[PDB]
Amino acid sequence: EFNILLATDSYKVTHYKQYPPNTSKVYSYFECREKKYEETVFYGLQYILNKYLKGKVVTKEKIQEAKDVYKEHFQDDVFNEKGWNYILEKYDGHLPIEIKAVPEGFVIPRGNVLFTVENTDPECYWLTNWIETILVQSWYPITVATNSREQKKILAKYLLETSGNLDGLEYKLHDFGYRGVSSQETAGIGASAHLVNFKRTDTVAGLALIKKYYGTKDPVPGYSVPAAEHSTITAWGKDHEKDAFEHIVTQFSSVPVSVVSDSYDIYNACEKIWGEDLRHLIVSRSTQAPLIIRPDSGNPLDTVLKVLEILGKKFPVTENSKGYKLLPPYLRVIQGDGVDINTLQEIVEGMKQKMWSIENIAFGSGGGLLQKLTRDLLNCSFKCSYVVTNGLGINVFKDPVADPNKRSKKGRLSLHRTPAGNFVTLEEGKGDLEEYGQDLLHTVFKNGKVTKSYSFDEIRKNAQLNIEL
Amino acid sequence: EFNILLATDSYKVTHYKQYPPNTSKVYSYFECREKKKYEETVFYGLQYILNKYLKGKVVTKEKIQEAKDVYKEHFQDDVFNEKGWNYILEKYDGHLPIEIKAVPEGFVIPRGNVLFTVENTDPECYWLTNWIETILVQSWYPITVATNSREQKKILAKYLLETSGNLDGLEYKLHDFGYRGVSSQETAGIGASAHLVNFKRTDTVAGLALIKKYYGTKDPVPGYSVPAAEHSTITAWGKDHEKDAFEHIVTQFSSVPVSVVSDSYDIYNACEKIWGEDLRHLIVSRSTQAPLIIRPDSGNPLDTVLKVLEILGKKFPVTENSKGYKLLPPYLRVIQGDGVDINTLQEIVEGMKQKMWSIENIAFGSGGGLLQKLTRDLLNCSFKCSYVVTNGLGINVFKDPVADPNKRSKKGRLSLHRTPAGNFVTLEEGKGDLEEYGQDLLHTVFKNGKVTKSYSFDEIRKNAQLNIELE
């Protein structure tokens, strides 16, 4: 069972002894610090609040467990047993913490306050930063959602330019990341974050998380389609690749089906097997049930371009209203190898230069979508900005001489709309001067209760692209 | 509750309809594929997965119906092998009819070798071997963390040996700071445990419980920490009271090691004037078992470490050790815990050696670099089908993409052996059966729902030792 007393960085166990004597309040905030990625999608805090922070999170057993572990871990007795007991006895184990946050799905420029944390009981001054570690992990869903959305911007731009519209945009980036992430829990969180922007996923874990923690009007937030993997082709034997293809497309004759075509020779598969031997099984398919040819090796751009050129000569290609080449509607391509935001950009621009519509293509991304991301990408950071000691409030901050980029904000913070309709973060409690209207943060957690929440539908609406709006 | 029927890549739900008819066996294997450096990998983490997710009654009526309901909406189609899953439930009381054989955990194996294999034990369950690919492949993560951590240990060992003449304290020189920088609580536990294969310092507490539950140590705990400040415990005193914060903290922790972050405003002022003059009397009186550990946390990591040492070396009594390298007094040490990964670690210790500073003086903290900035393609961790039986005939299968020879996979039934020179070789096409290469190093670790062989965390550590530690 999860124990919040054991879910922090070890050194934080010793911090209650380090703050100034008679400190009654510790107030801290999270931002994606300013230094590509000029704006971030706020997503994921609600999951953390519900799964880990709400309700009775302290018991006698959990306190004893943490005491016993930390005694051995530090080779010394430094654990604040009394402080945790206070929370157990006074609040029935509910955390005396208040969290204010921007609404989930909101798209906010870097360097703005996204959420704040403060203790609601003076005895629990130490609790604010105890939970830094668990709250800071919000960096991951924020970062997946943001990087996913930046890829949606690229796709929308090139789809609009080559086809004249955005039809199918939300199906153009398919999460293949389940095997390439670091755990089952990460799989669910990361997939859910991708689904803020798109509707295609093979990472099943994301569905249950969304259903449990957020909710959608639709039965599921994300979809997949039948597809082969290398084993369902190669198992037929090296001389029987054609037999494999035929069986598979016949088994899935009236739904879309993706068939990995590079087990031995992608160019042969496209030109000779699909393009000649099995062509009669492709040209007979429904617009609602295309074959999706899937290359999976080689230089992604060169391979996509060559596959398209091959198919373009074996199948009837049309020219859309924008002047770009379009495969017949029973035939599409998916590139699911080596795709990240950079190579995605390179492929669509390369297609555009060769006059191929982005209609023709979809992308699968795994490690690039859900794993190859760190807290440094958006400088996701949690810092103390305000304390009260001896009944006096002090605005606090860091400002390292050798890195002004690491300077933190001072005092009590609030988020506001500017006269031009942008966001601004006011420091030093200046939000109280009421020169900038109401604070846009909302209380989302207070004294063990989740006080405000968002459906996955409203998160999606908040996260929409300008061009979509 | 966890449902194994919902723990695969979506497309795998459709694969039972795609294999050749009359297929009774699907046999697959995992390797860290060679790539035309990380030449050897630590095999670690499978036991966690076997116990947490694969063993026992993992199929129930309710889990089957749950999966059916989800996949109906997810695919907008009824494709789902309910009969296949029902069979496992009825015939095996929901235990997976799978055999997994694996190299012992902790083993250090060169790239391009079989590390584990997977096959179905019942012909009806040919589809199940690759169903569980997704969950098993996630073993890439503890493998890669353990491997990358160990490679950093090699660098530390080489430089510690060169600059000091021994390896004392080597296991305490890389401290896991990664808890907040990983993607989830579960990941934190797994990654932290992987680091602890090589080292003993961690703030990622989640790793301890995982190890205790799934592996076990003779010692009460596998990993340790020491009291340390963060910026909040310094800055809360106010900008003009950094010295008061330092004093309060070192006095609170006067008899144990304590790390104090010293760059809140001006790291160089802090070292030279605050530690080096104002509070010097509190530092020089400390025990060798309770040093002050000064922590810079910003600026160019190499440049800053060198300047911190230069400053401290002129405020404190420095000795020259038997190797000719400078050494701070035993009550004073430094930890660089910002921007550390395997590359910057190498650059720092090399820069230190150039400036004649012993590696004894320094320790490292690594967070994102240690537990998060790693992917499955770092070691090309990969799971492929190499053997099937169709119509009673075994056939050796593989992929071999024309444009990428590096993605070619192995053929047939596999086994891992010692070579005459003591190295490793993976035999293909069932050639291990010729018995020309002594015993298969793969052991059955899972069979029909039961974990059949387990390793303690102590055995794993012994297996993962550096050669230099052995010598």
Author numbering:
A (entry chain B): 8 to 42, 53 to 486
B (entry chain A): 8 to 43, 53 to 487
Give sentences from the paper.
NAMPT functions as a homo-dimeric enzyme that catalyzes the rate limiting step in the primary salvage pathway for NAD synthesis, the transfer of a phosphoribosyl residue from 5-phosphoribosyl-1-pyrophosphate (PRPP) to nicotinamide (NAM) to produce nicotinamide mononucleotide (NMN). Crystal structures of NAMPT in numerous ligand-bound forms have been reported. These structures consistently display a NAMPT homo-dimer with two essentially identical active sites at the dimer interface. Furthermore, we determine the crystal structures of six NAMPT mutants in the apo form and in complex with various inhibitors and present a definitive model to explain the differential effects of the mutations on various structural classes of NAMPT inhibitors.
Unlike the G217A/V mutations, the G217R mutation caused more drastic reduction in the inhibitory potency for all compounds on our test panel. G217R causes His191 side chain to rotate to the same extent as G217V, while introducing additional changes to the structure of the NAMPT inhibitor-binding site. The R217 side chain competes for space with the bound inhibitor (e.g., with the terminal phenyl-trifluoromethyl group of GNE-618) in a similar fashion as H191R. Besides introducing steric clashes, the R217 guanidinium group also creates a basic patch at the surrounding protein surface that favors polar groups over hydrophobic groups. We conclude that these additional structural changes render the G217R mutation more deleterious for NAMPT inhibitor binding across structural classes. In contrast, NCI-H520 cells harboring the G217R mutant are similarly resistant to all 3 NAMPT inhibitors.
